[PDB]
Amino acid sequence: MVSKGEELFTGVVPILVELDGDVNGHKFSVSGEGEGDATYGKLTLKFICTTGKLPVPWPTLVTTLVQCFSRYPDHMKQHDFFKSAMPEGYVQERTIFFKDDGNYKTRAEVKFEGDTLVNRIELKGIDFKEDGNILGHKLEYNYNEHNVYITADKQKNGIKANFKIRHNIEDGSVQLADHYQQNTPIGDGPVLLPDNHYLDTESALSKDPNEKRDHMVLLEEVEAAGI
Ligand SMILES: [Ca+2]
Ligand SMILES: [Ca+2]
């Protein structure tokens, strides 16, 4: 393989996710667990809002809640920054602007701890409207396919990304969420700095009929493209 970290993804890998959030002073925690199969770009996760009712819609947290599981095609293996940063991992930071509403600011560390890929995140949301699409829970429980556009940031030894999520609203409108992303390695080992490309990202949301807690089951399928 072209990076040592890529070797950690040839099988099925257990995933743990932990998020601490505060949106307009509404504090919440989310815990997720599942597994990823990067050979196929697939992962399966179940998330619980452990603090009670989630005060924002689940779809607004999908991008925040492990792009190391993307499938890079064989001719694109030299462009996979994410796996190359493993096991020590990377910091992923975003600002997410919900058009005509508030924003999320997130900082996460994605790294291996033993056999498990862990994504630990802090989220702060501000300036949301209490009767808007987010705090009013007006988003449909569904998700569109989107391209994540990646470029190298050679002075941070990392990458940048930007993309625009389109969230369907229950009355037929759309809520746009403009994402700005930066990733930086945690360790000092060499990483792969990619040519421009994108991640073709599909997400499917569902429920577990036996889970009484507020929760989201998420299936993702992601493949790199564009070289
Ligand atoms: Ca597509
Ligand atoms: Ca596609």
Swiss-Prot record:
Alphabetized UniProt keyword annotations: Chromophore, Luminescence, Photoprotein
Mutation effect (residue 165 to V): In P9; increases fluorescence at 475 nm excitation. In R10-3; matures to the red-emitting state with excitation and emission maxima at 555 and 585 nm, respectively
Effect upon mutating residue 222 to R: In Azurite; shifts the excitation and emission spectra to shorter wavelengths and increases quantum yields compared to BFP
GO annotation terms (biological process): bioluminescence; generation of precursor metabolites and energy
Effect of substituting residue 204 to V: In EBFP1.2; shifts the excitation and emission spectra to shorter wavelengths and increases quantum yields compared to BFP
Statement: the UniProt record of this protein carries the keyword Zinc: no
Effect of residue 66 to N: In R10-3; matures to the red-emitting state with excitation and emission maxima at 555 and 585 nm, respectively
Uses in biotechnology: Green fluorescent protein has been engineered to produce a vast number of variously colored mutants, fusion proteins, and biosensors. Further generation of mutants led to more stable proteins (at 37 degrees Celsius for example) with brighter fluorescence and longer fluorescence lifetimes.
Outcome when changing residue 146 to D: In Cerulean; leads to improved quantum yield, a higher extinction coefficient and is 2.5-fold brighter than ECFP
Effect on the protein upon substituting residue 153 to V: In EBFP2.0; shifts the excitation and emission spectra to shorter wavelengths and increases quantum yields compared to BFP
Gene3D superfamilies tied to this protein: Green fluorescent protein
Effect on the protein upon substituting residue 201 to Y: Gives rise to yellow-emission variants. In EYFP; leads to yellow fluorescence, folds faster and more efficiently at 37 degrees Celsius and has superior solubility and brightness
Effect upon mutating residue 70 to A: Increases fluorescence at warmer temperatures such as 37 degrees Celsius. In GFPmut 3; highly fluorescent mutant when excited at 488 nm
Annotated TM spans: none
Effect seen on changing residue 77 to R: In Topaz; shifts the major emission and exitation peak up to 20 nm
Consequence recorded when altering residue 174 to A: In mut2.1; shifts fluorescence lifetime from 3.03 to 2.50 ns
Parts forming coiled coils: none
Mutation effect (residue 47 to L): In mut3.3; shifts fluorescence lifetime from 3.03 to 1.88 ns. In R10-3; matures to the red-emitting state with excitation and emission maxima at 555 and 585 nm, respectively
Known outcome of mutating residue 143 to F: In Sapphire/H9-40; exhibits a huge Stoke's shift, with an excitation peak at 399 nm and an emission peak at 511 nm. In Azurite; shifts the excitation and emission spectra to shorter wavelengths and increases quantum yields compared to BFP
Resulting phenotype, residue 97 to S: In alphaGFP/cycle 3 GFP; improves folding at 37 degrees Celsius, reduces aggregation at high concentrations, and increases the diffusibility of the protein inside cells
Task of the protein: Energy-transfer acceptor. Its role is to transduce the blue chemiluminescence of the protein aequorin into green fluorescent light by energy transfer. Fluoresces in vivo upon receiving energy from the Ca(2+)-activated photoprotein aequorin.
Family: Belongs to the GFP family.
The protein's assembly and partners: Monomer.
Name used for this protein in its record: Green fluorescent protein
Native source species: Aequorea victoria
